[PDB]
Amino acid sequence: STIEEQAKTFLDKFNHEAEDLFYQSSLASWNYNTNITEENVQNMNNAGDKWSAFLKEQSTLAQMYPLQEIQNLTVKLQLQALQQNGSSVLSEDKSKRLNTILNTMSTIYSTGKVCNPDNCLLLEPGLNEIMANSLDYNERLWAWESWRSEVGKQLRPLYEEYVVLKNEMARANHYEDYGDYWRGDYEVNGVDGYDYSRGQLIEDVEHTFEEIKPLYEHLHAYVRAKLMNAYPSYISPIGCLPAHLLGDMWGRFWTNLYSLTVPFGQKPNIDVTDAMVDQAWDAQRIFKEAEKFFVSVGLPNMTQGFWENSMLTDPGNVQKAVCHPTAWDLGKGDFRILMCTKVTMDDFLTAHHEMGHIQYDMAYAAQPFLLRNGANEGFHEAVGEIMSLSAATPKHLKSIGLLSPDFQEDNETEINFLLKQALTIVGTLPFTYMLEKWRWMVFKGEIPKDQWMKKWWEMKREIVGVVEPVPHDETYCDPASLFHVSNDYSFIRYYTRTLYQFQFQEALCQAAKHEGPLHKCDISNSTEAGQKLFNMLRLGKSEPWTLALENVVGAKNMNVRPLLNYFEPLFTWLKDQNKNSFVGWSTDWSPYAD
């Protein structure tokens, strides 16, 4: 008679029907990604529309069960996602044009290309590969500047419509703006004291970034000092670095600059590529050695169907498969991974990452279909990264025999390793905080359409310290060409991931009683840390992420302390080398303004 009995009955039946159609929808996308055929492209759209329209039909009966009469926390969370109508709240004209803009911006990004000024290569892989190893000033500027001319300027009217259509959806959902929609993933309500406001994330990412500045300023001055001798006129000691020299198009990762930034070139570097050649290992034993890593910590092994259905290579051009590593979770215990596995040092750490998502999905797999998910968008990739961090340590490499036991491990070897991770990690946080905060300000309405590029480069010199060689007007749009913004994917998950992975790295090493620096820690063979982590992995989003985080690290929010401690050995070395230079940068310097 009560609403709770009627709501639970709807959820018990919905979990079965939604799980059956989601498996066929994910299976149709699997056959299309592994094999390109005319039959699979139609099955992906057919099975994809059946699952998409299924949530739209069940959303009508979901809004008929108010959450005010339900005293259960697990029931209200299962009805929280079903209460939203998605795009049904938009008008018929705006709903149909919404999928058109998303498909048009995704097509232009895939079909976009920059023809050689001297002699036409597509961006991915073509332009993304050249910009990595290019040391030329003009060659990098030609591909960086001419791209946004036919893309950033062309996607501007499509980006303006993208802002208007998505703002009307948040207004019908009783959200302040569309920037608050992505902040609703961290929303926590229903528990006394653990409630987390949506507007709190704005103050959280801003406060944690303040303590990141002293660590980032020393690294930004270290990279600038190495590239200062090349172009002393364009690169000022108190100025900023050019945008096209960051190592790739958008400057997401600085790993491409690790070649020239090596502190000591007279010492060898740790590489498992040449070691796997003499051992003669194939793609079959790479996942097998990584499966034993999950057994040493107490986590269950992989099912027989997982290793049998794995795709280990690309059989030529007859049957083409996407080589981008991705962990696909279909359902009902069906776990598969599509990756092209060669013999490299990076594929070894990638195998622990791709298997980390599958191992993460095994803990909460006992939960209903509505309760199967990460607690947030940052916990998905963070679980796979902490598995790879323990594998990259010299202690784990000497255990299985990749690295020689007589290899000398000292400060000179470890500082070289911490710098490579810093270019990927430390360089990501200011860039992710910059672009995400810019989207929140434009979607809110604080920045007029004419000041989009005016505030973009102005706030860029303040955060990441990057100035444009060629000034741009309001016609260009930098985020429009980005992969995540154009494809409507969460850009905030990259900033919080760094803070979540380092908290878990410090907590697991304290449970196993590891001593010394944190980068020397290895979680292998230690079953004590796997038991404390397994309790949170099986919770998913059925429990508040603030409550599940306290059960591991004892903290109710994000904290910079594990970020500083793990980078502390590198921070002390960068401070001594930057004494001869100026720590920090100025926002009043420009390459074309003298």
Partner: protein, 97 residues
């Protein structure tokens, strides 16, 4: 390796909803629509009216834990009727003198 086939097998169903719990050794084949609330159903699907029988997805691609198992349950009951079924016997060699 037998029941599961490519495309799914919808022949095997199960009763998801019932107003109460079944008694021991009871079989209910009734297809009557389950009524969750007080809303009338009358055999028509709708609000608070759900079709109880649901389908088992069967394909070889599913995980090992969820693979369907054929279960044969033997019910052993001793009544006052004369006993007939007994265990197997054993015959030995015959010797004389």
């Amino acid at each position: 390796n037998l029941d599961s086939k490519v495309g799914g097998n919808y022949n095997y169903l199960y009763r998801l909803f019932r107003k109460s719990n079944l008694k021991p050794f009871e079989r209910d084949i009734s297809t009557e629509i389950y009524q969750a609330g007080s809303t009338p159903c009358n055999g028509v699907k709708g609000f608070n009216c759900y079709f109880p029988l649901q389908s088992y997805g069967f394909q070889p691609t599913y995980g090992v834990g969820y693979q369907p198992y054929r279960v044969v349950v033997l019910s052993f009951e001793l009544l006052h009727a004369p006993a007939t079924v007994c265990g197997p016997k054993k015959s030995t060699n015959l010797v004389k003198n």
